[PDB]
Design a protein around this ligand. Structure first.
Ligand SMILES: O=C(CSCc1cc(C(F)(F)F)cc(C(F)(F)F)c1)Nc1ccc(Cl)cc1C(=O)O
Ligand SMILES: O=C(CSCc1cc(C(F)(F)F)cc(C(F)(F)F)c1)Nc1ccc(Cl)cc1C(=O)O
Ligand SMILES: *[C@@H]1O[C@H](CO)[C@@H](O)[C@H](O)[C@H]1NC(C)=O
Length: 497
């Protein structure tokens, strides 16, 4: 429909510039005839999910790289892709004029955009808030008589969530995560620093905190929002650390195990929200598989845990087989889900680097690594930030796929946005990862999936500067002959029947 308006900020690629009356977009999804394939391409040189089509060939000769689909090697099914409606994101979006807000929301959630189907919702304040608050700040209110949603929810996050769901054609799933409890539930009496829940699982502090989850879900249900899942706590290991600067609530794995078994699981299960899923961990994958063993080998906790949520800081490259892989091996029926990731903390770089192609590549490289190790979904952090990477009450600024420039009634879609969309637009909920084997060593990241309707999707990221010729073999249809430009990302789609 409308192409990227490119702007360079002097980094290696461009942003796409959007405002009240213009934003780049897609025509309605139009599917390739049998015997042909669709290609979407994004390049550092400036191409932005450009559509092309080509033929599937009956035969193939050559010594070039061959990727063979193995459609009967079946792995995980996909839940979805999306990002976090933090106070900061909601505040930034709503500071735009209304027509610009709608183009920003459509970019993420419309079929004219990249089809997000997950929204992560903080339960009260986090560092990407402009102030600290919980939903029950009256001291020692164990009955939660004064539990209340503030304007951050009722005027910023909830109205935006409603509009995102209105624009989406696919069902959107909401995921909720708390950063801190009320300070009067905590050993240290503060929203941050080293501190856990007072007392012992089963007792009044732990029951009150479990009930706070139900009150949150009650309150959101009164606003006609229902949740797919909640996490047990955001980054529980953070609250074990002296001086931790951000809202947090410490749990060892044993404390999480017992809080879930004694308080949170039973309280949710006996509520009208018993169908909400409970995810554990919601923390750096370096804590796996130990955290998973502690919680899931206790059947009184395991019966309440639907899944394991993981974070990653994309400024780092770290092991995945030994953490995600070994965890899946131990607990193959407990899904892994990436609930938060971000980039932009290296001291020698801007927190927001407008046009960074490297940062886009770190998104898709992470997404592909996650999918190759059983992860069912991938959730970005802030849906939008200002050009400083905020606001953030502790000045912990990072990057975001959409950057809002309030003074200009403009927003910029970063390479990260398009690297996300190469997955989110083309991998609907229920898609299943399948096998994909390489004929020789290569510098590509690739993953293959089958949609629910049977058709195929392959994402190829070229980590190198060289163009790489490659062929994809699908025994049902033949050969897809193509080239992967250096640094590029491609998504291929084709019918199989
Ligand atoms: O997380 C990491 C990744 S290890 C470095 C590494 C090794 C290799 C390999 F040798 F394997 F090829 C390739 C790459 C590549 F990404 F460039 F391709 C990077 N390291 C850091 C991360 C952040 C900061 Cl600030 C410092 C460090 C640090 O290690 O100095
Ligand atoms: O030691 C520190 C202070 S802890 C913060 C930290 C450490 C590292 C780590 F060193 F662990 F890699 C990486 C990052 C990240 F921003 F990349 F995520 C942040 N910082 C660095 C030390 C050396 C260098 Cl080269 C850079 C930094 C830097 O802060 O950017
Ligand atoms: C918004 O962007 C479009 C496309 O570049 C441009 O034609 C229009 O003038 C812009 N509007 C404002 C107010 O800058």
């Amino acid at each position: 429909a409308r192409p990227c308006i490119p702007k360079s900020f002097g980094y290696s690629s461009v942003v796409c510039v959007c405002n009240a009356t213009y934003c780049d977009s897609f025509d309605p999804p139009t599917f390739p005839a049998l015997g042909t394939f669709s290609r979407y391409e994004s390049t550092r040189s400036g191409r932005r999910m450009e559509l092309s089509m080509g033929p599937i060939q009956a035969n193939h000769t050559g010594t070039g790289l061959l990727l063979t689909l193995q459609p009967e090697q079946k792995f995980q099914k996909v839940k979805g892709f999306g990002g976090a409606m933090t106070d900061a994101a909601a505040l930034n979006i709503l500071a735009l004029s209304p027509p610009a807000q709608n183009l920003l929301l459509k970019s993420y959630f419309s079929e004219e955009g990249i089809g997000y189907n997950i929204i992560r919702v903080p339960m009260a304040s986090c560092d990407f808030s402009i102030r600290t608050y919980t939903y029950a700040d009256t001291p020692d209110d164990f009955q939660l008589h004064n539990f209340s949603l503030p304007e951050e929810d009722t005027k910023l996050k909830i109205p935006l969530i409603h509009r995102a769901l209105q624009l989406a054609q696919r069902p959107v799933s909401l995921l909720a995560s708390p950063w801190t409890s009320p300070t009067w539930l905590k050993t240290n009496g503060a929203v941050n620093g080293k501190g856990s829940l007072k007392g012992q699982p089963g007792d009044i502090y732990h029951q009150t905190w479990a009930r706070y989850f139900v009150k949150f879900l009650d309150a959101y249900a009164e606003h006609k929002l229902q949740f797919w899942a909640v996490t047990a706590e955001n980054e529980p290991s953070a609250g074990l650390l002296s001086g931790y600067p951000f809202q947090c609530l410490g749990f060892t794995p044993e404390h999480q195990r017992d809080f879930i078994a004694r308080d949170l699981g039973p309280t949710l299960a006996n509520s009208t929200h018993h169908n909400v899923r409970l995810l554990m961990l919601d923390d750096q994958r370096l804590l796996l598989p130990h955290w998973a063993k502690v919680v899931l080998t206790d059947p009184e906790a395991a019966k309440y845990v639907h899944g394991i949520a993981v974070h990653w800081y994309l400024d780092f490259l770290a092991p995945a087989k030994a953490t995600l892989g070994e965890t899946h091996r131990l607990f193959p029926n407990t899904m892994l889900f990436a609930s938060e990731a971000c980039v932009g903390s290296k001291f020698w770089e801007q927190s927001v680097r407008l046009g960074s192609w490297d940062r886009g590549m770190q998104y898709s490289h992470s997404i592909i690594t996650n999918l190759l190790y059983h992860v069912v979904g991938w959730t970005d952090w802030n849906l939008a930030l200002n050009p400083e990477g905020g606001p953030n009450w502790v000045r912990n600024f990072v990057d975001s796929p959409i950057i809002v420039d309030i003074t200009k009634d403009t927003f910029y879609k970063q390479p990260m946005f398009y690297h996300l969309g190469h997955f989110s637009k083309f991998i609907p909920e229920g898609s299943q990862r399948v096998g994909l084997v390489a004929s020789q060593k290569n510098d590509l990241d690739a993953v293959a999936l089958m949609h629910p309707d049977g058709s195929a999707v392959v994402v190829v990221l070229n980590r190198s500067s060289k163009d790489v010729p490659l062929t994809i073999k699908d025994p049902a249809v033949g050969f897809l002959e193509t080239i992967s430009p250096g640094y590029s990302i491609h998504t291929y789609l084709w019918h199989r029947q």
